[PDB]
Amino acid sequence: SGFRKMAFPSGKVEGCMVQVTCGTTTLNGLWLDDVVYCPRHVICTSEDMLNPNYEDLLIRKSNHNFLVQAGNVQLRVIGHSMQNCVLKLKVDTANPKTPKYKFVRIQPGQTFSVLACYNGSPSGVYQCAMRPNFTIKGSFLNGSCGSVGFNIDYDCVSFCYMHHMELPTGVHAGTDLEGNFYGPFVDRQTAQAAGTDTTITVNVLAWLYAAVINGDRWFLNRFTTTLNDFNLVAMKYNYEPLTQDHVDILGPLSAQTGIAVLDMCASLKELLQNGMNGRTILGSALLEDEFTPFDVVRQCS
Amino acid sequence: SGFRKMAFPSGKVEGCMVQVTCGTTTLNGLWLDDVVYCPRHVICTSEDMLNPNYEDLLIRKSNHNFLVQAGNVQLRVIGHSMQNCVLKLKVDTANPKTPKYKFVRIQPGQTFSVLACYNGSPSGVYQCAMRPNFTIKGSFLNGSCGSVGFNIDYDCVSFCYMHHMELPTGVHAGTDLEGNFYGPFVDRQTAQAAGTDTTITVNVLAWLYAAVINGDRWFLNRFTTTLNDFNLVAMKYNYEPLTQDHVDILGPLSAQTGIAVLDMCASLKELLQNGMNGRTILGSALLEDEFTPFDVVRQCSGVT
Numbered sequence: 001s002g003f004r005k006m007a008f009p010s011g012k013v014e015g016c017m018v019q020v021t022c023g024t025t026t027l028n029g030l031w032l033d034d035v036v037y038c039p040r041h042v043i044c045t046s047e048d049m050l051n052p053n054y055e056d057l058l059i060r061k062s063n064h065n066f067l068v069q070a071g072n073v074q075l076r077v078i079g080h081s082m083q084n085c086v087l088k089l090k091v092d093t094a095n096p097k098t099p100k101y102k103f104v105r106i107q108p109g110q111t112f113s114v115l116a117c118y119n120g121s122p123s124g125v126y127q128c129a130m131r132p133n134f135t136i137k138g139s140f141l142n143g144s145c146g147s148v149g150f151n152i153d154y155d156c157v158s159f160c161y162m163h164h165m166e167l168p169t170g171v172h173a174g175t176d177l178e179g180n181f182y183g184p185f186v187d188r189q190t191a192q193a194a195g196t197d198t199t200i201t202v203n204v205l206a207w208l209y210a211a212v213i214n215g216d217r218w219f220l221n222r223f224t225t226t227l228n229d230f231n232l233v234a235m236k237y238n239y240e241p242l243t244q245d246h247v248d249i250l251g252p253l254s255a256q257t258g259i260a261v262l263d264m265c266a267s268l269k270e271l272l273q274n275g276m277n278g279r280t281i282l283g284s285a286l287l288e289d290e291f292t293p294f295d296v297v298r299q300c301s
Numbered sequence: 302s303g304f305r306k307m308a309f310p311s312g313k314v315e316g317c318m319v320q321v322t323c324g325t326t327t328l329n330g331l332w333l334d335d336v337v338y339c340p341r342h343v344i345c346t347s348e349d350m351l352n353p354n355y356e357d358l359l360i361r362k363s364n365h366n367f368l369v370q371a372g373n374v375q376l377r378v379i380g381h382s383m384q385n386c387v388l389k390l391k392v393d394t395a396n397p398k399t400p401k402y403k404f405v406r407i408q409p410g411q412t413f414s415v416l417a418c419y420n421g422s423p424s425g426v427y428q429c430a431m432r433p434n435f436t437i438k439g440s441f442l443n444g445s446c447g448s449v450g451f452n453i454d455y456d457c458v459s460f461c462y463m464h465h466m467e468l469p470t471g472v473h474a475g476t477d478l479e480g481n482f483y484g485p486f487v488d489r490q491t492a493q494a495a496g497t498d499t500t501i502t503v504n505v506l507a508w509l510y511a512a513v514i515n516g517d518r519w520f521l522n523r524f525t526t527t528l529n530d531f532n533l534v535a536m537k538y539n540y541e542p543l544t545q546d547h548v549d550i551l552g553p554l555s556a557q558t559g560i561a562v563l564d565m566c567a568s569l570k571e572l573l574q575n576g577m578n579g580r581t582i583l584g585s586a587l588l589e590d591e592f593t594p595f596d597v598v599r600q601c602s603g604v605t
């Protein structure tokens with residue numbers, strides 16, 4: 001028992017992190033097979049930050065303008081191309097530590113581990129969720145760009161995030177590994193702001209199910225709700241709508257605990273109304289929304 | 302910006318995890334050089350576990366009773382011995398992935414990363430603190446025994462914890478890598494309970510400094526206090542005493558944010574007395590005590 005924000009073991013990713021330098025700018029890249037993936041904004045200068053023309057900046061570069069260091073070793077760049085907002089540097093050596101991997105684009109509410117890196121070297125690992133407003137609440141300093149997010153769902157690393165920038169609210173924006181941004185963001189230093197963020201209702205419910213599995217019942221009640229009345233109330237606390245898909249997904253947790261999904265929804269309604277009155281749930285005084293239904297089953301049973 | 306419970310990258314430890322089987326029990330071992338380290342309770346059956354004589358159970362075992370698997374390879378056990386509550390299995394192959402390492406015993410209040418494992422396969426990594434009552438609030442299922450905790454101090458892995466058991470309250474007990482328990486626990490199935498726990502004052506202050514560095518400032522106030530008056534308040538709220546050494550350790554954070562330790566203690570005083578009045582700090586409605594001063598400096602400075 002116990003319940004912790006748990007990240008995936010980071011070793012498989014650590015063996016892929018390299019440093020990429022262009023001009024005066026160094027950030028991180030991800031070396032898989034014979035390709036290094038990194039944010040295309042590595043090719044920007046001070047002048048290019050508001051309205052970079054990436055095609056025009058990139059045509060002016062040769063392979064030898066890109067310095068890639070993997071640990072103590074320089075890799076030879078032998079090709080370059082851009083896909084959306086990621087740069088792909090072809091290199092003359094396949095990474096012998098390339099894991100089994102795939103690229104997956106995630107939906108809001110999905111969680112992943114982030115391996116934060118500086119100068120191609122891992123600093124730390126933590127768990128994040130893709131917020132409804134398509135930001136993540138990470139921990140990133142200058143030089144962290146090109147750090148990645150991932151899941152490992154057997155021996156296969158699923159890369160789902162690469163870090164590009166910090167927005168003024170202190171939250172973080174990035175792309176999938178095909179270089180498409182999550183959300184309406186662009187790799188320009190124009191004024192951009194995140195939409196107002198909401199709580200990920202399905203994850204909160206999952207976590208309440210985790211509390212039950214770990215032997216905590218104090219917040220249940222004798223009531224039920226319709227899905228529509230739940231959503232009418234939850235919206236007023238800035239909770240995401242719960243859909244029939246969400247209800248279906250909670251089915252296994254429902255069946256394990258003996259508590260119907262709409263019954264757990266009633267419990268949540270009451271918690272929003274009453275707060276916790278000095279009590280905690282799995283060690284928190286707030287309702288946690290960064291554990292998915294899948295995460296709960298994996299960590300509990 | 303931002304502040305997260307962050308674990309050390311676990312790759313160097315992942316390469317040391319193996320599976321150990323004895324009879325019907327499988328759990329995890331740590332393979333360094335030519336020795337596999339694991340909980341000595343692996344040798345017990347149900348009936349032994351109530352009152353084990355480990356020396357007597359162990360003398361009955363041959364090397365071939367211990368099956369050690371590192372991935373899909375069997376290692377050959379060529380020796381066995383006990384040190385305190387850890388079993389040491391000599392094997393015929395040195396781990397080619399052995400990192401630079403040391404064995405260290407940590408103090409209550411100190412944090413470390415735990416790599417949770419099942420059948421010798423790392424499953425997850427998280428950050429823990431050694432509670433004042435010498436438990437950890439971990440997340441462990443059956444098969445997790447022999448999972449380890451560690452810090453990385455440069456390129457050197459410092460191993461500080463090996464998981465042995467769960468206590469009835471759902472918290473966790475284990476040893477250092479020399480087999481000495483943290484806390485007043487024994488490796489047997491008897492009623493054992495954690496002492497009442499306290500809050501790690503110095504870490505709470507560290508975390509308040511982290512909040513300030515990230516721009517969360519509403520709890521600062523104009524007041525200061527003395528160590529003695531603060532300690533009278535900490536004692537009242539089941540907080541560990543704050544020592545002069547704690548104050549020294551927070552020195553960097555004090556100088557960086559312009560908030561002296563005893564000034565920040567006056568902030569914490571007020572929070573204990575009045576609560577948070579509907580507000581949060583770094584997204585939490587409780588005072589977090591599982592970041593050390595070092596943890597805060599490391600994460601707000603990008604050490605790698």
Ligand SMILES: *C(=N)c1cc(Oc2ccc(I)cc2)ncn1
Pocket residue numbers: 026027041044049141142143144145146164165166186187188189
């Ligand atoms: C990444 N490691 C990083 C990014 C920044 O700022 C930045 C640069 C370009 C764009 I387009 C957006 C944001 N500063 C330091 N390090």
Ligand SMILES: *C(=N)c1cc(Oc2ccc(I)cc2)ncn1
Pocket residue numbers: 327328329342350442443444445446447465466467487488489490
């Ligand atoms: C370790 N993987 C493990 C331990 C237990 O229970 C147990 C065994 C011996 C003692 I002494 C205490 C507790 N069950 C499953 N897995």
Ligand code: NA
Pocket residue numbers: 521522523524525563564565567568
């Ligand atoms: Na003050």
